[PDB]
Symmetry: C3
Protein backbone atom coordinates (compact mmCIF):
# COMPACT_ATOMS: atom_id res chain seq x y z
CA UNK A 1 0.00 0.00 0.00
CA UNK A 2 0.97 3.64 -0.48
CA UNK A 3 -0.05 6.37 1.96
CA UNK A 4 0.65 10.07 1.32
CA UNK A 5 -0.02 12.97 3.72
CA UNK A 6 0.22 16.60 2.52
CA UNK A 7 -0.02 19.18 5.31
CA UNK A 8 0.63 22.83 6.17
CA UNK A 9 2.09 21.74 9.54
CA UNK A 10 5.83 22.61 9.71
CA UNK A 11 8.56 20.01 9.16
CA UNK A 12 9.66 20.49 12.79
CA UNK A 13 6.24 19.40 14.06
CA UNK A 14 6.48 15.93 12.47
CA UNK A 15 7.65 13.46 15.24
CA UNK A 16 10.85 11.57 14.31
CA UNK A 17 9.26 8.05 14.31
CA UNK A 18 6.11 9.16 12.43
CA UNK A 19 6.82 7.31 9.14
CA UNK A 20 7.66 4.16 11.12
CA UNK A 21 4.46 4.39 13.15
CA UNK A 22 2.37 4.90 10.00
CA UNK A 23 4.07 1.89 8.38
CA UNK A 24 3.38 -0.33 11.39
CA UNK A 25 -0.20 0.89 11.94
CA UNK A 26 -1.14 0.63 8.24
CA UNK A 27 0.29 -2.88 8.01
CA UNK A 28 -1.90 -3.95 10.96
CA UNK A 29 -4.93 -2.15 9.57
CA UNK A 30 -4.67 -3.45 6.03
CA UNK A 31 -3.34 -6.89 6.85
CA UNK A 32 -0.57 -6.26 4.33
CA UNK A 33 3.03 -7.09 5.35
CA UNK A 34 5.04 -3.99 6.52
CA UNK A 35 7.57 -4.53 3.73
CA UNK A 36 5.01 -3.53 1.08
CA UNK A 37 3.98 -0.31 2.85
CA UNK A 38 5.24 3.00 1.42
CA UNK A 39 4.68 6.20 3.41
CA UNK A 40 5.20 9.80 2.26
CA UNK A 41 4.80 12.94 4.41
CA UNK A 42 4.89 16.43 2.85
CA UNK A 43 4.90 19.27 5.43
CA UNK A 44 5.12 23.08 5.08
CA UNK A 45 2.54 23.04 2.28
CA UNK A 46 0.61 26.05 1.04
CA UNK A 47 -3.00 24.92 1.61
CA UNK A 48 -6.44 25.92 2.87
CA UNK A 49 -9.41 23.84 4.03
CA UNK A 50 -12.78 25.59 3.97
CA UNK A 51 -10.94 28.85 3.32
CA UNK A 52 -8.98 28.53 6.55
CA UNK A 53 -5.18 28.27 7.00
CA UNK A 54 -5.47 26.32 10.25
CA UNK A 55 -3.64 22.92 10.31
CA UNK A 56 -5.13 20.51 7.81
CA UNK A 57 -4.15 17.39 5.83
CA UNK A 58 -4.98 16.09 2.34
CA UNK A 59 -4.18 12.39 2.07
CA UNK A 60 -4.59 9.30 -0.05
CA UNK A 61 -4.27 5.55 0.46
CA UNK A 62 -3.73 3.27 -2.54
CA UNK A 63 -4.04 -0.49 -2.16
CA UNK A 64 -4.66 -3.57 -4.28
CA UNK A 65 -7.75 -4.74 -2.40
CA UNK A 66 -8.50 -4.09 1.30
CA UNK A 67 -10.51 -1.00 0.29
CA UNK A 68 -14.25 -0.84 0.99
CA UNK A 69 -17.09 0.82 2.88
CA UNK A 70 -16.33 -0.68 6.28
CA UNK A 71 -12.56 -0.81 5.86
CA UNK A 72 -12.34 2.85 4.77
CA UNK A 73 -14.28 4.00 7.85
CA UNK A 74 -11.81 2.28 10.21
CA UNK A 75 -8.81 3.57 8.20
CA UNK A 76 -10.21 7.11 8.64
CA UNK A 77 -10.53 6.67 12.43
CA UNK A 78 -7.00 5.28 12.59
CA UNK A 79 -5.49 7.94 10.32
CA UNK A 80 -7.37 10.95 11.74
CA UNK A 81 -6.41 9.67 15.19
CA UNK A 82 -2.71 9.63 14.26
CA UNK A 83 -2.82 13.03 12.53
CA UNK A 84 -4.65 14.55 15.50
CA UNK A 85 -2.32 13.09 18.13
CA UNK A 86 1.03 13.45 16.36
CA UNK A 87 0.48 16.45 14.10
CA UNK A 88 -2.24 18.18 16.15
CA UNK A 89 -4.55 18.38 13.12
CA UNK A 90 -8.28 18.47 13.81
CA UNK A 91 -10.07 15.41 12.27
CA UNK A 92 -12.59 17.63 10.48
CA UNK A 93 -9.71 19.30 8.60
CA UNK A 94 -8.52 16.02 7.05
CA UNK A 95 -9.52 14.51 3.67
CA UNK A 96 -8.35 11.03 2.65
CA UNK A 97 -8.91 9.64 -0.84
CA UNK A 98 -9.02 5.84 -1.03
CA UNK A 99 -8.06 3.99 -4.21
CA UNK A 100 -8.64 0.28 -4.83
CA UNK A 101 -5.90 -0.36 -7.40
CA UNK A 102 -6.08 -3.13 -9.96
CA UNK A 103 -2.95 -5.31 -9.67
CA UNK A 104 -2.16 -4.76 -13.39
CA UNK A 105 -2.07 -1.00 -12.70
CA UNK A 106 0.59 -1.08 -9.99
CA UNK A 107 4.16 -1.25 -11.17
CA UNK A 108 6.92 -2.60 -8.96
CA UNK A 109 10.36 -4.09 -9.52
CA UNK A 110 10.37 -3.96 -13.33
CA UNK A 111 6.90 -5.47 -13.71
CA UNK A 112 3.39 -5.17 -12.26
CA UNK A 113 1.54 -7.18 -9.59
CA UNK A 114 -0.76 -8.83 -12.15
CA UNK B 1 -13.93 18.97 -3.13
CA UNK B 2 -10.13 18.90 -3.29
CA UNK B 3 -8.14 20.92 -5.83
CA UNK B 4 -4.37 20.62 -6.20
CA UNK B 5 -2.10 22.68 -8.47
CA UNK B 6 1.54 21.69 -9.03
CA UNK B 7 3.56 24.31 -10.94
CA UNK B 8 7.14 25.39 -11.77
CA UNK B 9 6.11 29.01 -11.15
CA UNK B 10 8.07 30.38 -8.15
CA UNK B 11 6.49 30.74 -4.69
CA UNK B 12 6.83 34.53 -4.95
CA UNK B 13 4.63 34.56 -8.07
CA UNK B 14 1.61 33.07 -6.25
CA UNK B 15 -0.70 35.98 -5.26
CA UNK B 16 -1.46 36.15 -1.53
CA UNK B 17 -5.21 35.61 -1.87
CA UNK B 18 -4.91 32.83 -4.43
CA UNK B 19 -6.06 29.94 -2.22
CA UNK B 20 -9.06 31.99 -1.05
CA UNK B 21 -9.99 32.92 -4.61
CA UNK B 22 -9.78 29.30 -5.70
CA UNK B 23 -11.93 28.27 -2.70
CA UNK B 24 -14.62 30.85 -3.51
CA UNK B 25 -14.61 30.21 -7.28
CA UNK B 26 -14.68 26.41 -6.92
CA UNK B 27 -17.56 26.61 -4.42
CA UNK B 28 -19.59 28.64 -6.94
CA UNK B 29 -18.61 26.39 -9.83
CA UNK B 30 -19.33 23.07 -8.08
CA UNK B 31 -22.28 24.26 -6.03
CA UNK B 32 -20.56 22.79 -2.97
CA UNK B 33 -20.40 24.94 0.21
CA UNK B 34 -16.99 26.76 0.63
CA UNK B 35 -16.41 24.97 3.94
CA UNK B 36 -15.93 21.63 2.11
CA UNK B 37 -13.39 23.00 -0.36
CA UNK B 38 -9.71 22.13 0.18
CA UNK B 39 -7.09 23.83 -2.00
CA UNK B 40 -3.39 22.99 -2.32
CA UNK B 41 -0.78 24.92 -4.36
CA UNK B 42 2.75 23.53 -4.88
CA UNK B 43 5.15 26.00 -6.57
CA UNK B 44 8.85 25.78 -7.49
CA UNK B 45 8.37 22.33 -8.97
CA UNK B 46 10.80 20.57 -11.30
CA UNK B 47 8.60 19.92 -14.31
CA UNK B 48 8.38 19.99 -18.11
CA UNK B 49 5.37 20.06 -20.45
CA UNK B 50 6.01 18.94 -24.02
CA UNK B 51 9.72 18.95 -23.25
CA UNK B 52 9.64 22.66 -22.35
CA UNK B 53 10.44 24.32 -18.99
CA UNK B 54 8.15 27.28 -19.62
CA UNK B 55 5.46 27.87 -16.93
CA UNK B 56 3.01 24.98 -16.71
CA UNK B 57 0.58 23.41 -14.22
CA UNK B 58 -0.46 19.79 -13.47
CA UNK B 59 -3.70 19.78 -11.50
CA UNK B 60 -6.48 17.58 -10.20
CA UNK B 61 -10.01 18.10 -8.90
CA UNK B 62 -11.66 15.41 -6.76
CA UNK B 63 -15.33 15.61 -5.90
CA UNK B 64 -18.19 13.34 -4.84
CA UNK B 65 -20.46 14.09 -7.78
CA UNK B 66 -20.48 17.33 -9.80
CA UNK B 67 -18.04 15.75 -12.29
CA UNK B 68 -19.05 15.13 -15.91
CA UNK B 69 -18.54 16.01 -19.57
CA UNK B 70 -20.19 19.44 -19.46
CA UNK B 71 -19.14 20.31 -15.91
CA UNK B 72 -15.50 19.42 -16.59
CA UNK B 73 -15.35 21.69 -19.65
CA UNK B 74 -16.50 24.72 -17.62
CA UNK B 75 -14.16 23.86 -14.76
CA UNK B 76 -11.30 23.88 -17.28
CA UNK B 77 -12.27 27.34 -18.53
CA UNK B 78 -12.54 28.63 -14.97
CA UNK B 79 -9.28 27.05 -13.80
CA UNK B 80 -7.21 27.84 -16.90
CA UNK B 81 -8.54 31.37 -16.61
CA UNK B 82 -7.36 31.70 -13.00
CA UNK B 83 -3.96 30.09 -13.66
CA UNK B 84 -3.42 32.30 -16.73
CA UNK B 85 -4.37 35.52 -14.96
CA UNK B 86 -2.82 34.95 -11.53
CA UNK B 87 0.12 32.68 -12.31
CA UNK B 88 0.67 33.76 -15.94
CA UNK B 89 0.54 30.16 -17.14
CA UNK B 90 -0.54 29.58 -20.74
CA UNK B 91 -3.81 27.49 -20.90
CA UNK B 92 -2.23 25.01 -23.28
CA UNK B 93 0.40 24.21 -20.66
CA UNK B 94 -2.18 23.11 -18.08
CA UNK B 95 -3.48 19.56 -17.43
CA UNK B 96 -6.33 18.91 -14.97
CA UNK B 97 -7.35 15.38 -13.93
CA UNK B 98 -10.95 15.09 -12.77
CA UNK B 99 -12.05 12.39 -10.32
CA UNK B 100 -15.67 11.58 -9.47
CA UNK B 101 -15.12 10.04 -6.01
CA UNK B 102 -17.50 7.53 -4.48
CA UNK B 103 -18.65 8.80 -1.08
CA UNK B 104 -17.43 5.56 0.59
CA UNK B 105 -13.94 6.31 -0.75
CA UNK B 106 -13.55 9.74 0.81
CA UNK B 107 -12.46 9.83 4.43
CA UNK B 108 -13.22 12.79 6.66
CA UNK B 109 -13.54 13.37 10.39
CA UNK B 110 -12.96 9.76 11.51
CA UNK B 111 -15.38 8.23 9.01
CA UNK B 112 -16.31 8.48 5.33
CA UNK B 113 -19.12 10.34 3.53
CA UNK B 114 -21.06 7.12 2.79
CA UNK C 1 0.39 11.66 -20.69
CA UNK C 2 1.46 12.80 -17.23
CA UNK C 3 4.29 11.10 -15.31
CA UNK C 4 5.17 12.04 -11.73
CA UNK C 5 8.12 10.73 -9.67
CA UNK C 6 8.33 11.40 -5.91
CA UNK C 7 11.65 10.35 -4.36
CA UNK C 8 13.84 10.81 -1.27
CA UNK C 9 16.89 11.11 -3.55
CA UNK C 10 18.42 14.63 -3.23
CA UNK C 11 17.84 17.34 -5.84
CA UNK C 12 21.56 17.26 -6.68
CA UNK C 13 21.34 13.60 -7.67
CA UNK C 14 18.80 14.23 -10.47
CA UNK C 15 20.73 14.44 -13.81
CA UNK C 16 20.16 17.71 -15.65
CA UNK C 17 18.60 16.12 -18.81
CA UNK C 18 16.36 13.75 -16.78
CA UNK C 19 13.00 15.42 -17.57
CA UNK C 20 13.92 15.54 -21.26
CA UNK C 21 14.92 11.87 -21.28
CA UNK C 22 11.68 10.88 -19.55
CA UNK C 23 9.69 12.95 -22.08
CA UNK C 24 11.43 11.29 -25.03
CA UNK C 25 11.31 7.76 -23.61
CA UNK C 26 7.64 8.02 -22.59
CA UNK C 27 6.66 9.39 -26.00
CA UNK C 28 8.28 6.35 -27.67
CA UNK C 29 6.78 3.91 -25.15
CA UNK C 30 3.23 5.27 -25.28
CA UNK C 31 3.22 6.22 -28.95
CA UNK C 32 1.96 9.64 -27.89
CA UNK C 33 3.59 12.76 -29.43
CA UNK C 34 6.28 14.36 -27.16
CA UNK C 35 4.34 17.60 -27.08
CA UNK C 36 1.56 16.02 -24.97
CA UNK C 37 3.97 14.54 -22.39
CA UNK C 38 4.17 16.28 -18.99
CA UNK C 39 6.87 15.15 -16.56
CA UNK C 40 7.22 16.08 -12.86
CA UNK C 41 10.10 15.08 -10.52
CA UNK C 42 9.92 15.75 -6.76
CA UNK C 43 13.19 15.03 -4.89
CA UNK C 44 14.22 15.42 -1.24
CA UNK C 45 10.97 13.83 -0.06
CA UNK C 46 10.34 12.45 3.42
CA UNK C 47 9.42 8.84 2.62
CA UNK C 48 9.90 5.20 3.60
CA UNK C 49 9.38 1.98 1.64
CA UNK C 50 8.95 -1.17 3.72
CA UNK C 51 9.98 0.84 6.75
CA UNK C 52 13.35 1.69 5.18
CA UNK C 53 14.74 5.16 4.29
CA UNK C 54 16.93 3.81 1.50
CA UNK C 55 16.35 5.43 -1.94
CA UNK C 56 12.84 4.75 -3.23
CA UNK C 57 10.32 6.25 -5.68
CA UNK C 58 6.49 6.53 -5.68
CA UNK C 59 5.24 7.31 -9.17
CA UNK C 60 2.19 7.50 -11.38
CA UNK C 61 1.45 7.55 -15.10
CA UNK C 62 -1.87 8.96 -16.35
CA UNK C 63 -2.88 8.48 -19.96
CA UNK C 64 -6.01 8.48 -22.09
CA UNK C 65 -5.61 4.93 -23.37
CA UNK C 66 -2.30 3.09 -23.89
CA UNK C 67 -2.71 1.55 -20.41
CA UNK C 68 -3.12 -2.19 -20.00
CA UNK C 69 -1.70 -5.45 -18.68
CA UNK C 70 1.06 -5.84 -21.27
CA UNK C 71 1.73 -2.12 -21.73
CA UNK C 72 2.05 -1.52 -17.97
CA UNK C 73 4.66 -4.27 -17.61
CA UNK C 74 6.90 -2.73 -20.29
CA UNK C 75 6.41 0.79 -18.82
CA UNK C 76 7.60 -0.62 -15.47
CA UNK C 77 10.75 -2.10 -17.04
CA UNK C 78 11.44 1.19 -18.83
CA UNK C 79 10.72 3.36 -15.81
CA UNK C 80 12.50 1.22 -13.20
CA UNK C 81 15.41 1.01 -15.62
CA UNK C 82 15.65 4.81 -15.83
CA UNK C 83 15.21 5.32 -12.07
CA UNK C 84 17.85 2.70 -11.34
CA UNK C 85 20.38 4.06 -13.83
CA UNK C 86 19.90 7.83 -13.34
CA UNK C 87 18.74 8.05 -9.72
CA UNK C 88 20.36 4.84 -8.43
CA UNK C 89 17.06 3.63 -7.00
CA UNK C 90 16.62 -0.13 -6.64
CA UNK C 91 13.70 -1.42 -8.82
CA UNK C 92 12.12 -3.20 -5.84
CA UNK C 93 11.82 0.14 -4.03
CA UNK C 94 9.69 1.69 -6.79
CA UNK C 95 5.87 1.78 -7.02
CA UNK C 96 4.10 3.13 -10.12
CA UNK C 97 0.34 3.68 -10.26
CA UNK C 98 -1.16 3.54 -13.75
CA UNK C 99 -4.37 5.41 -14.60
CA UNK C 100 -6.35 4.95 -17.82
CA UNK C 101 -8.07 8.35 -17.93
CA UNK C 102 -11.37 8.92 -19.70
CA UNK C 103 -10.94 11.75 -22.23
CA UNK C 104 -13.84 13.70 -20.60
CA UNK C 105 -11.90 13.61 -17.33
CA UNK C 106 -8.76 15.28 -18.60
CA UNK C 107 -8.88 19.06 -18.83
CA UNK C 108 -6.54 20.95 -21.15
CA UNK C 109 -6.57 24.39 -22.78
CA UNK C 110 -9.97 25.55 -21.52
CA UNK C 111 -11.78 22.34 -22.38
CA UNK C 112 -11.37 18.57 -22.08
CA UNK C 113 -10.20 15.94 -24.57
CA UNK C 114 -13.70 14.51 -25.06
C1 LIG D 1 2.23 -8.82 -2.76
O1 LIG D 1 0.94 -8.24 -3.07
C2 LIG D 1 0.56 -7.10 -2.38
O2 LIG D 1 -0.22 -7.06 -1.40
C3 LIG D 1 1.20 -5.84 -2.97
C4 LIG D 1 0.80 -4.54 -2.23
C5 LIG D 1 1.43 -3.25 -2.79
C6 LIG D 1 0.17 -2.48 -3.09
C7 LIG D 1 0.15 -1.06 -3.68
C8 LIG D 1 -1.04 -0.54 -4.23
C9 LIG D 1 -1.06 0.74 -4.75
C10 LIG D 1 0.10 1.52 -4.74
O3 LIG D 1 0.07 2.78 -5.25
C11 LIG D 1 1.30 1.02 -4.20
C12 LIG D 1 1.33 -0.27 -3.67
N1 LIG D 1 -0.90 -3.12 -2.80
O4 LIG D 1 -0.61 -4.29 -2.32
C1 LIG E 1 -22.29 17.71 2.06
O1 LIG E 1 -21.20 16.84 1.71
C2 LIG E 1 -20.41 17.17 0.61
O2 LIG E 1 -20.82 17.58 -0.48
C3 LIG E 1 -18.93 16.99 0.91
C4 LIG E 1 -18.01 17.35 -0.28
C5 LIG E 1 -16.51 17.17 -0.02
C6 LIG E 1 -16.17 16.26 -1.18
C7 LIG E 1 -14.76 15.75 -1.45
C8 LIG E 1 -14.52 14.68 -2.34
C9 LIG E 1 -13.23 14.24 -2.57
C10 LIG E 1 -12.14 14.86 -1.92
O3 LIG E 1 -10.86 14.43 -2.14
C11 LIG E 1 -12.38 15.92 -1.04
C12 LIG E 1 -13.67 16.36 -0.80
N1 LIG E 1 -17.17 15.96 -1.91
O4 LIG E 1 -18.24 16.55 -1.45
C1 LIG F 1 -3.89 12.95 -29.35
O1 LIG F 1 -4.42 12.72 -28.01
C2 LIG F 1 -3.53 12.31 -27.03
O2 LIG F 1 -2.69 11.40 -27.16
C3 LIG F 1 -3.66 13.12 -25.74
C4 LIG F 1 -2.68 12.68 -24.62
C5 LIG F 1 -2.70 13.51 -23.33
C6 LIG F 1 -2.97 12.44 -22.31
C7 LIG F 1 -3.05 12.76 -20.82
C8 LIG F 1 -3.76 11.94 -19.91
C9 LIG F 1 -3.80 12.27 -18.55
C10 LIG F 1 -3.12 13.43 -18.08
O3 LIG F 1 -3.15 13.75 -16.74
C11 LIG F 1 -2.42 14.24 -18.98
C12 LIG F 1 -2.38 13.91 -20.33
N1 LIG F 1 -3.11 11.28 -22.81
O4 LIG F 1 -2.98 11.34 -24.12
Amino acid sequence: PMFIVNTNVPRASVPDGFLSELTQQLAQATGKPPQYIAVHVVPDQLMAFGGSSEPCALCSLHSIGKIGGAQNRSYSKLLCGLLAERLRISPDRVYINYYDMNAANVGWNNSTFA
